[PDB]
Structures are given as C-alpha cells and as structure tokens.
Copies of this chain bind each other. A is one copy, B any other.
Amino acid sequence: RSFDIYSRLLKERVIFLTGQVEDHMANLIVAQMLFLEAENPEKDIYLYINSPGGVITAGMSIYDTMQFIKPDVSTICMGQAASMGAFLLTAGAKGKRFCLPNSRVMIHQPLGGYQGQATDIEIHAREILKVKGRMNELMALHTGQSLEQIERDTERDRFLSAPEAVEYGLVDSILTHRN
C-alpha cells in the first residue's frame, strides 16, 4: 500500500541516504542495494542524498558496495551533500550523478581524534593520514581533477553550488524539471 512510503519507493529502486552517515543507517543503505541487485541485477538503482556527512568507515561500506554491485547506482543530491556525503554523491555511476538546482555541496579532508600514549597517537595519526591519502585518490578518480588539485581544494571546507558542482566534476549534471 502506502503504509510505508520508503518501501513503495524501494520497489522503484529508489534508496534514500538521509542525514548523518553512520554504521546502522549505512548498513541499511548497503542491504537495500544488495536487495535491488538480487531483484534485477541490470536496472539502475537511484540513491538520493541529503546528508551533512558522517563516519568514514561507515561511508566506505556504502562506497565499496556501490562499486561492487553490478547495477549502476545513479546518485541524486537534494538539499545538501557535505563531506562524506559529497564523497558518496560523486562516487555514483559515471554520467549518472546529479544535483537539483539549489542543492549545495561542501568538500573537505577527514576529521578525527585519538587519545593515548605517544606511540599509539603515532600509529593512529599515521593512519588518519593513510585514509586522507586514499580519500583524495578516490576523489581525483571519480571527479576527473588531479590528486594535487583535490588536496589543495580540500584542505579546508569548500562549498559548491549545483552548477559549480558540475563544473568541478563531482556530478555530471543538474536536474531541473521532469521532461
């Protein structure tokens, strides 16, 4: 029926990634995808995104899953897709990444923090550095820009309008009306 609306929509292969990114809402996204791949492993799957960002590992379970499943996950951003949100948007199938008119994007490097003995802090920061390294690589890839270029652009929070977003390479185009 219309008992659950996100369900009816799931049947239309529409998945919503809304707000904060974290393990449980991430895991729910991931399973929603595996389910759509088993249903029909050919049809695209649409993933709407309105999110301030969130936990990185939780984000990579989503990312690796999108690339892993045969279906092409198109991505469409409404409202906003900041940080790992923006990362996921641009991680969508090629040519199948959008942004509605007034949605906004924000990009930036990884945030984190540890607490401990110098040695452990060493082992942990070293690590958040490997991750920044891989986060930037993957962004160069998906967006087209170059490693050097991203790290520059991403050292500090950076905003992009729907247009600037396409111009930059995070999304392929702006959806304006249903034609």
- Chain A interface (Cβ within 8 Å of chain B)? 1-12, 14, 16, 18-19, 23-24, 26-28, 30-32, 34-35, 37-38, 41, 48, 50-52, 57-61, 63-65, 67-70, 78-80, 100-104, 106, 108-132, 134, 138, 155-159, 161, 175-178
Contacts and interface: CB of A to CB of B under 8 A. Distances in A.
Contacts of A3: 3-4, 7
B31 A16 contact: yes
A157 B123 contact: yes
A156 B119 CA distance: 9
Nearest to A155: B119
Given A111-B117, A178-B37, A103 B61 contact: yes
A67 B159 CA distance: 23
19 contacts: A2-B32, A5-B31, A9-B35, A26-B79, A50-B58, A60-B80, A60-B102, A63-B102, A64-B78, A67-B101, A68-B100, A68-B178, A111-B115, A112-B117, A118-B132, A119-B156, A120-B157, A122-B129, A123-B158
Contacts of A9: 31, 34-35, 38
Nearest to A161: B130
Contacts of A111: 115-118
Contacts of A65: 78, 100
